[PDB]
Each structure stands twice: as structure tokens, then as C-alpha cells.
Design a protein around this ligand. Structure first.
Ligand SMILES: *[C@@H]1O[C@H](CO)[C@@H](O[C@@H]2O[C@H](CO)[C@@H](O[C@@H]3O[C@H](CO[C@H]4O[C@H](CO[C@H]5O[C@H](CO)[C@@H](O)[C@H](O)[C@@H]5O)[C@@H](O)[C@H](O[C@H]5O[C@H](CO)[C@@H](O)[C@H](O)[C@@H]5O)[C@@H]4O)[C@@H](O)[C@H](O[C@H]4O[C@H](CO[C@H]5O[C@H](CO)[C@@H](O)[C@H](O)[C@@H]5O)[C@@H](O)[C@H](O)[C@@H]4O)[C@@H]3O)[C@H](O)[C@H]2NC(C)=O)[C@H](O)[C@H]1NC(C)=O
Ligand SMILES: [Ca+2]
Length: 467
């Protein structure tokens, strides 16, 4: 174990920034203390019902919110809370269970949360548990190609793909968002097997022709060939792209394959998917066999920070281009917040049918406590220090406090366009792992989890550079 760099949370110099940061910590005490009060040990909290919530993505594993919150608690100086969480994990976190889990979700939340807790604290239990879980996920890769199953029974090792997935195919974002965690699993366990699995994924992908430079969201694990040619930088695709860039950064820039894959991918996305509305907003559309659908998801909004984070490493005279593209995605995504009643954006928003940056379908008007817009504000603040990004982040804080904060915690909303809240009764674990961590960091100095020394996984779990 090596002492971690930049884990001290010194108070900002400006009194107003100090006060704003203290508010975000207070919001975390509200989310955490209510989770502990009504749902301790269960995966998530139902804040209206004041009971536990057990998403099917996690099967019979326990304590998702405990594990997802560990690192946020640590950096906020919540040491009593961190110790209670550690004691529960030592006694009760068990991966020897008989149910199916999403390999992807368990990796980014449980493996990632345990890894960050270990690197921040040095407590060996976190390392031991991360490796235990990695070992349990290894049967997911038992396919003819090495492209893993979506869903794995932890006891039997038997896997399968989503039943609706084109021809029984695996999902790009799912198998493409294992890389960072598996590289650290090999480092800490000394066992090459984890890196071998994620490097085999690379081998399969690089053998395929990418239609127009684009990656279909579906890849069959038996044949190793594409399913239907649906392409998106939001759901089903998003974090695969994210992890190409971050694999390169986290390798101390030695993973040259990752770098080329990333910049090639983003150029094809710019050409075929990125458009400007008649009102002047930049958006990322979805592509289906050549035909654009002029719609962007809240999930897609993470891409603003991705583009900005990759700017420093971009080719000669392309760095400002990517900082500016990041800023335009940030602005569009801020407009999706601005044009609502509650000032929190919808799950999807459109740029045709006579609209710009608003939802039209009733079933896409919801907000489930998502971090991706605030995530992009954090990167834009740290990479430009333009005060507007702190201004926009604080607008979201005031919105959350006005419309999502309830007596029993924080709840998502079913319709951001009307006055009367319709609470969905789920406190998503990613609100504690991501939304509040990124808010806290925005109102901190740059030297708390400095971006030069820490690369965030897709669930806001910071990992150190591997040399
Ligand atoms: C968050 O959301 C808010 C909305 O809540 C956004 O605010 C809007 O921003 C718009 C874009 O900047 C802006 O549109 C411009 O409006 C200018 C006119 O404003 C003045 O007049 C209007 C109208 O008054 C008459 O009509 C009303 C009824 O509508 C009557 O009640 C009056 O008696 C008059 O008869 C006033 O309402 C305005 O006053 C309000 O707004 C002011 C701020 O604008 C406030 O200070 C006031 O207190 C008051 O609330 C003003 O007095 C237009 O001149 C301007 O027109 C240019 O742009 C057009 C659009 O260009 C793009 O799109 C086209 C189409 O695709 C492309 O061709 C172009 O290339 C561009 O891509 C262009 O078509 C024109 O030809 C002109 O070049 C423009 O329409 C809104 O006024 C503003 N609304 C409000 C209420 O504030 C805000 O931007 C969002 N973001 C942020 C960060 O806040
Ligand atoms: Ca993410």
C-alpha cells in the first residue's frame, strides 16, 4: 500500500464557496442517515415508503448503497460513517449467492466502490472483497468469443444475455465498461487472468469492420459478429467510449491501442451523429442503419466531460476544439434543465417535431437523480475555471433541494415539466456515489482528487494511475 495523493479536503478560501460545499455535505448526511435508518444492508432506499429497494440488477447481493457511498463518505471526512460501513462489509458482504446479476452493474458499483475505498483508506478488507467478487465474475467470459454474458448466476456460473437483445447479442457498453476495474484486479491480486479477459474483448472488437467508423451496440458472443446496426453515445454505448479514453489515461498513457480507438471513434461520432439545431444547440443523435433520430438522452450528457477530459491528449491543434465541443454539450444539457419546470432535465429530449431540448413523450419526462450533467459541469469547471459552471451546478443544487429532497431522503421525479411533484420512491445508489460526489468536488479546490492522479470509473469511483 502507498499513501494516496490529494485526499485531504482543506476548506476553500472564499466564504461563499465554503458555505456551498458544507451544504452538499449536509445533503449527503441526509441521504446517508435516511438510508441507514430505513434500509441498512439492503441495496437501496425507498425514501417515500421508508423501506428497502432491491433492484433485480443486483440479484441477492446486499449493500449496494453502502459500497457505492464508501469513497464519497471518505473524501467528505465522514470517518465515523466510513467505519460503520467497513464493519458491515467485513461481516455481511457475501458474493456466494444463488441468483442472476448484471455483470456490468456489479462491476462498476461493487468492484469499483471497493477498489476506491481500498486505495483511499488502505484497509485490506476492501482489497480482499474486490478480488473475491472478480473471481466470481470470471465465468461470464466462458463463451466461444470471450465476449461476456450480460447476466450471470453467481453460484452456478451459468450466464445468458438480455432476452430482447438482437439475436441474443451482448451489449457494447456492458462488455466495454469492465476494463478499468479488471486492470486493477490483476494488479492487486497478482493474477493476470483479469487483464486477459478484458484484453480479449479488445481483440474481438479490433477484428471487426466498424460500419462508417461506428460501433453497433450489439455483438454476438458465439459468432463474434455484430447484431443490428444501432449506434448511440447514450444508453447501450456511452461508457464503452468513456473507458477507451480512461484506459489510456489510467495506464500512464501506455495503452496506445485505447488512445487510437478513442480518437477514431469520436471522429466518426462527430461526422455521423453530432448535429446543430436551428436554434444553435449542439446535440448527439442516434443512428439506426444510416437513419438519424434527433433525440439525446440525459445519459448522453456525460460526453461533454469526456470530450473535455480528452482535449489535453488530443492531436496538434485539436485541443481547443474538444474543450469547445465539451462546452457546447454542457450548454445544450443545461438548456434541457433550463426549459423544465423543476430545473432538472428529462431522461430524453428532442430536436425535431417543432421542439428543441425538451421531451415530447410522457415516458421520457422523468429524472431519476442522475449525475451526468453535473459530472460534465465538474470537468468543465476544473478544465476552464469559468464561473458559469459553478453557477449552473448551484442551480441544480437548489432544484434538488426544492423538488427531490423529502423527509426520508431523496426521490426521483416522473415529470419535470409540471408543478406538482410525482415521486418515484427510489433513492438511486448513484446519487450518493456520483451526483453528490461531483457536486462536492465542484465546490472544492482542484487538489482534492486531482485529475492528474485519479481517473474516475463510470460510477464516480476514483482509481489511481497504474504505471
Ligand atoms: C433559459 O430559458 C430562457 C427562457 O425562459 C431563455 O431566454 C430566452 O432567450 C431567447 C434566446 O436568446 C430570447 O429570444 C430572443 O428574443 C429577442 C426579443 O426579446 C425582446 O422582445 C420580447 C418580445 O416582446 C414582444 O412580444 C411579447 C410577446 O412575446 C410582448 O409581451 C411584448 O409586448 C412585445 O410585443 C420580450 O419579451 C423580451 O423581454 C423578456 O425577455 C428579456 C430577455 O430576452 C428580459 O430581459 C425581459 O425582462 C423579458 O422577460 C425582449 O424585450 C429577439 O430579438 C431575439 O431574436 C434574434 O434571435 C432569433 C433566434 O435566433 C436563433 O434561432 C433562429 C431560428 O432557428 C436562427 O435563424 C438563428 O440563426 C439563431 O440560431 C432570430 O430568429 C431573430 O431573427 C433574431 O436574430 C430572440 O428571439 C428570449 O427573449 C428569452 N426569453 C426570456 C423570457 O428571457 C434563456 O436563453 C435560457 N438560457 C439561459 C442561460 O438563461
Ligand atoms: Ca457513468
Amino acid at each position: 500500500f502507498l499513501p494516496p495523493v490529494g485526499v485531504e479536503n482543506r476548506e476553500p478560501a472564499d466564504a461563499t464557496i465554503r458555505e456551498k460545499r458544507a451544504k452538499i455535505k449536509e445533503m449527503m448526511t441526509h441521504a446517508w442517515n435516511n438510508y441507514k435508518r430505513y434500509a441498512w444492508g439492503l441495496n437501496e432506499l425507498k425514501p417515500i415508503s421508508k423501506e428497502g429497494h432491491s433492484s433485480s440488477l443486483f440479484g441477492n447481493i446486499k449493500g449496494a448503497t453502502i459500497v457505492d457511498a464508501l469513497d464519497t463518505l471518505f473524501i467528505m471526512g465522514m470517518k465515523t460513517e466510513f467505519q460503520e460501513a467497513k464493519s458491515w462489509i467485513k461481516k455481511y458482504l457475501d458474493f456466494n449467492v444463488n441468483a442472476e446479476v448484471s455483470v456490468f452493474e456489479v462491476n462498476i458499483r461493487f468492484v469499483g466502490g471497493l477498489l476506491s475505498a481500498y486505495y483511499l483508506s488502505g484497509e485490506e478488507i476492501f482489497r480482499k472483497k474486490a478480488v473475491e467478487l472478480g473471481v466470481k465474475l470470471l465465468p461470464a467470459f466462458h463463451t466461444p468469443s470471450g465476449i461476456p454474458w450480460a447476466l450471470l448466476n453467481m453460484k452456478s456460473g451459468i450466464g445468458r444475455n438480455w432476452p430482447w437483445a438482437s439475436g441474443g447479442s451482448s451489449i457494447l457498453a456492458e462488455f466495454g465498461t469492465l476494463h478499468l476495474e479488471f486492470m486493477h484486479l490483476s494488479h492487486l491480486s497478482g493474477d493476470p487472468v483479469f487483464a486477459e479477459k478484458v484484453m480479449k474483448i479488445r481483440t474481438v472488437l479490433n477484428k471487426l469492420d466498424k460500419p462508417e467508423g461506428l460501433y453497433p451496440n450489439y455483438l454476438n458472443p458465439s459468432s463474434g459478429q455484430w447484431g443490428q446496426h444501432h449506434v448511440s453515445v447514450g444508453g447501450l454505448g456511452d461508457s464503452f467510449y468513456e473507458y477507451l479514453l480512461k484506459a489510456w489515461l489510467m495506464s500512464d498513457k501506455t495503452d496506445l491501442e485505447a488512445k487510437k480507438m478513442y480518437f477514431d471513434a469520436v471522429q466518426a461520432i462527430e461526422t455521423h451523429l453530432i448535429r446543430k439545431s436551428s436554434g444553435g444547440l449542439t446535440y448527439i443523435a442516434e443512428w439506426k442503419g444510416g437513419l438519424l433520430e434527433h433525440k439525446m438522452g440525459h445519459l448522453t450528457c456525460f460526453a461533454g466531460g469526456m470530450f473535455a477530459l480528452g482535449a489535453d491528449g488530443a492531436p496538434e491543434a485539436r485541443a481547443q476544439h474538444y474543450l469547445e465541443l465539451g462546452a457546447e454539450i454542457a450548454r445544450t444539457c443545461h438548456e434541457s434543465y433550463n426549459r423544465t419546470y423543476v430545473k432538472l432535465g428529462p431522461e430524453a429530449f428532442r430536436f425535431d417535431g417543432g421542439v428543441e431540448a425538451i421531451a415530447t413523450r410522457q415516458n421520457e419526462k422523468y429524472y431519476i437523480l442522475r449525475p451526468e450533467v453535473i459530472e460534465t459541469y465538474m470537468y468543465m469547471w476544473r478544465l476552464t475555471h469559468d464561473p458559469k459552471y459553478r453557477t449552473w451546478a448551484w442551480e441544480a443544487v437548489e432544484a434538488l433541494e426544492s423538488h427531490c429532497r423529502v423527509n426520508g431522503g431523496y426521490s426521483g421525479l416522473r415529470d419535470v415539466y409540471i408543478a406538482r411533484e410525482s415521486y418515484d420512491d427510489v433513492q438511486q445508489s448513484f446519487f450518493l456515489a456520483e451526483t453528490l460526489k461531483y457536486l462536492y468536488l465542484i465546490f472544492s479546490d482542484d487538489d482534492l482528487l486531482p485529475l492528474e492522479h485519479w481517473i474516475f470509473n463510470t460510477e464516480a469511483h476514483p482509481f489511481p494511475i497504474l504505471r
